[PDB]
Design a protein around this ligand. Structure first.
Ligand SMILES: [Ca+2]
Lengths: 180, 186
C-alpha cells in the first residue's frame, strides 16, 4: 500500500532551473523513491514520508522568495500498483521547523469506485473547517489557506480519512507561494 | 450537462504577468463563462467550446516563445452541478489558430467517478492515444502523450468524450509543457 505524489514545481522567474534544483537538493529525499522527468517528479513511499518530503520541497522553494507554485496529485491504492519503486520518522520536520510559507491552496479529492464519494468529499471539507484552514468551495475544488505546516496537515488528514474508507484515492493540490 | 476546465498557466519567466494576460486576451473567450482568481481560471461551457478555448490559450501562451506550462482539470457531470455560470456551436478559435503550432508533451490522468469499470475506460483512453499516434508511455499515476498541440488536444477531447458517454461524472487532469529548455529541437 505504497503512497505516491506526482508533482511539478513552477518558479515564475528567469532563475527557474536553479530554484527547482535547489528545492529538491535541499530536501532530505532519503525516505522516498524519486523519478524526475521534464514535466514532473514522482515520490513513492509511506504516507508519512511522501507528505514529509512534499512539505519540505514546498517550504524550500517558497523560501527562495520567488513566486512558486506546487501542483501535484497524491495517489494510493491504484489497482495493480507495483511493489517496487519504493525505498516512521519525518526526516525533514526538524530541518524545516523554523521555515514558514503561506500556502493558499485549491484541492480536489477523487475516491475511485466509491458510491459514497460525495460524502467523503463533504467529510474532507468538515475536516478543513475543524482545523481552521477551509476558505470556501469553488467550481471543481475546495480552497484552503494558512501557513504551509497547517495546510499540509489538513491535506494529509483528508487523504488519510479517505484512504482508510476507499481502496483507490487520488487528490490534486495546487499551492501558491509569494503570489504578487 | 455543462463542461468545465479549471487551469493554471505557469510562465517560467520574469515576464509572467504579461504572458498570462496576453494568452487570455488573445483567445476568443466569447463562448465560455470564465472566472479568474490568484491560483487558477475556470472556463465553463459546452465540451466543444471549453476544449476550443483551452487549445487556443495553450497555443497563444506557447507562441510567446517562453517556457510555459498549462496544468488543469476538465470536469463534467459532477452531482448537483449548477445550471448557471455558462453561456447558452462553431469552434470560434479554430480558424484564428489554424496556423499556430506548439509542441505539447503531456501527462494526463482520467478519473471516471463512481464507476466500477474505470480501469477499463482508462485502458480505452490509452487505446485512443495509440490509435491517434500521440501515446508515448505509461508512468506512475498518468499516461504520457506527445506531438503538436492540435494533435494532443484532439486526443484529450476524444478521451474525455469517450468517458463522458460511458459515465455520469468524470474528471481529467492535464499537464502540458511548451518550450522546455531541456527539449532537443531540430
Ligand atoms: Ca479575446
Amino acid at each position: 500500500r505504497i503512497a505516491g505524489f506526482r508533482f511539478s514545481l513552477y518558479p515564475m522567474t528567469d532563475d527557474f532551473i536553479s530554484v527547482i534544483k535547489s528545492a529538491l537538493a535541499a530536501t532530505d529525499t532519503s525516505k522516498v523513491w524519486t523519478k524526475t522527468d521534464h514535466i514532473s517528479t514522482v515520490l513513492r513511499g509511506s504516507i508519512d514520508h511522501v507528505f514529509d518530503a512534499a512539505k519540505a520541497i514546498y517550504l524550500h522553494a517558497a523560501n527562495s522568495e520567488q513566486h512558486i507554485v506546487m501542483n501535484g496529485t497524491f495517489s494510493i491504492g491504484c489497482p495493480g500498483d507495483t511493489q517496487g519503486d519504493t525505498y516512521d520518522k519525518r526526516v525533514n520536520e526538524d530541518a524545516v521547523r523554523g521555515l514558514k510559507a503561506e500556502a493558499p491552496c485549491q484541492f480536489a479529492l477523487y475516491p475511485m469506485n466509491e458510491p459514497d464519494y460525495m460524502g467523503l468529499i463533504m467529510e474532507a471539507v468538515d475536516i478543513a473547517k475543524a482545523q481552521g484552514t477551509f476558505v470556501q468551495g469553488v467550481h471543481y475544488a475546495s480552497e484552503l489557506d494558512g501557513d504551509a505546516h497547517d495546510v499540509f496537515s489538513t491535506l494529509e488528514a483528508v487523504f488519510r480519512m479517505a484512504e482508510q474508507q476507499t481502496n483507490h484515492i487520488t487528490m490534486t493540490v495546487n499551492l501558491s507561494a509569494n503570489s504578487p
